[PDB]
Paper text:
Rab GTPases play a crucial role in vesicular trafficking through shuttling between cytosol and membranes, a process that is controlled by several regulatory proteins. Another translocated effector protein LidA is also involved in the recruitment of early secretory vesicles to the LCV. LidA was found to interact with Rab1 as well, regardless of nucleotide binding states, and promote SidM/DrrA activity of transporting Rab1 to the LCV. Here, we present the crystal structures of LidA (residues 224-559) in complex with a GDP-bound Rab1 mutant (S25N; residues 1-176) and LidA (residues 188-449) in complex with GTP-bound Rab1 (residues 1-176).
To understand the underlying molecular mechanisms, we solved the crystal structure of LidA (residues 188-449) in complex with the Rab1(WT; residues 1-191) at 2.2 Å. The structure of the complex is highly similar to that of LidA(224-559)-Rab1(S25N) with an r.m.s.d of 0.678 Å for Rab1; 1.496 Å for LidA, respectively. As anticipated, GTP is well defined in the crystal structure and its interactions with Rab1 are conserved in other active Rabs. The hydrogen bonding interactions between the γ phosphate group of GTP with Thr43 and Gly69, from switch I and switch II of Rab1 respectively, are highly conserved among Rab proteins and important for stabilizing their active state. Our structural analyses suggest that LidA utilizes a similar mechanism to GTP for maintaining Rab1 in the active conformation. The GTP-Rab1-LidA structure shows truncation of the middle and the ring fingers does not disrupt Rab1-LidA complex, so that the thumb or the index fingers, though necessary, may not be sufficient to release Rab1. In the structure of GTP-Rab1-LidA we can see even the middle and the ring fingers are truncated, LidA can still holds Rab1. Deletion of the switch-stabilizing structural elements would be expected to disfavor LidA interaction with the GDP-bound Rab1 as compared to the GTP-bound Rab1. In support of the structure-based prediction, the assay showed that the LidA fragment exhibited a higher binding affinity (0.43 µM) to the GTP-bound Rab1 than to the GDP-bound Rab1 (2.4 µM).
Numbering used by the authors:
A (entry chain B): 257 to 448
B (entry chain A): 6 to 176
Amino acid sequence: SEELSLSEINEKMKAFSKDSEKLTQLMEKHKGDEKTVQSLQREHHDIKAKLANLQVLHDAHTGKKSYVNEKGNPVSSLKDAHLAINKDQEVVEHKGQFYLLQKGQWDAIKNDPAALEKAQKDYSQSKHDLATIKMEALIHKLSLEMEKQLETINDLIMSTDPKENEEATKLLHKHNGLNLKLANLQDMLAVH
Amino acid sequence: PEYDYLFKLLLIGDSGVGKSCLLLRFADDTYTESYISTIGVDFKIRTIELDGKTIKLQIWDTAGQERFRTITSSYYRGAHGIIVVYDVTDQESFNNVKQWLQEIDRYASENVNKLLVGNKCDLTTKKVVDYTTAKEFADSLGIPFLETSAKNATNVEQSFMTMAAEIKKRM
Ligand SMILES: Nc1nc2c(ncn2[C@@H]2O[C@H](COP(=O)(O)OP(=O)(O)OP(=O)(O)O)[C@@H](O)[C@H]2O)c(=O)[nH]1
Ligand SMILES: [Mg+2]
């Protein structure tokens, strides 16, 4: 699986922001209809989370975040990564206890149970979210591939030569085969 | 294969209401009872003649099943008209027309044309959605409305012609 390129990340974030803005207008328009308003809010929350997940990959591509393994040592690629952390963060680990905290602050949290518990929580949440981002990344990548097929299925089918149209027809089959895989990816995501 | 107009249409609505059968009746003049759920989209092209003008229609038939509606925003791009289909023998499919319409609002162009189709009107004794209740709804939103039978071909040609006529006059 090739990662999403920066152009792909930007194109998705742009579509999600646009969709988010439209959901907001719609909530305003249906105010008073508690069923539709509730469903629109559920959609908007979902789009917002996907946007935030794309922003993490954006930060990673621009150096505001760095990929690291479970111990917090730097790694090259996303497939190798266990967390993406900020410039000012570090991991502390011992015998299966992992802490994510601000760089230099181990002295400050060492004797503080609330800060300890927070650092463990942040580590685990960060690990799980990176797993979510990887899965969404694959879904986004696959979806962008199917989208660019539509543009192409179109002109091909426009043509009258039984060659380019019979092509379009096999392109449509392939497109639909991808939709089967995309749906199954969406299923796993929901489990995680 | 020259034309004076070129319109992109979508069919949307619940699984099993007859979107694909409407597509196949209109574009291929065929009907079959064998069924496979539409996995993503199907696409047919057909030309009609309206007010002396040749209209090439690009018709996209979408999946009713939510698990296959991953890239719907992409199907709406450049759509001139959307046909919302329900099954006249199935109340839930009609109840869901409200949500389908809200999907149009969300993904389609602001000025997109809409058409409500109640399919399977050949099933006269099985019909549970009254014509007047359907048409009152359509009318309440300025949406044209027809009842069709993909199986017997009733109103199928007329439906696409009515859609093409709505779009032609807003150009
Ligand atoms: N009696 C009658 N049955 C019909 C008519 N149209 C469709 N059906 C039946 O309804 C079934 C569903 O038709 P489809 O067009 O495949 O339904 P769909 O909306 O495309 O469903 P999905 O692809 O799952 O979204 C068909 O297999 C037919 O048996 C009709 O005009 N009359
Ligand atoms: Mg179908």
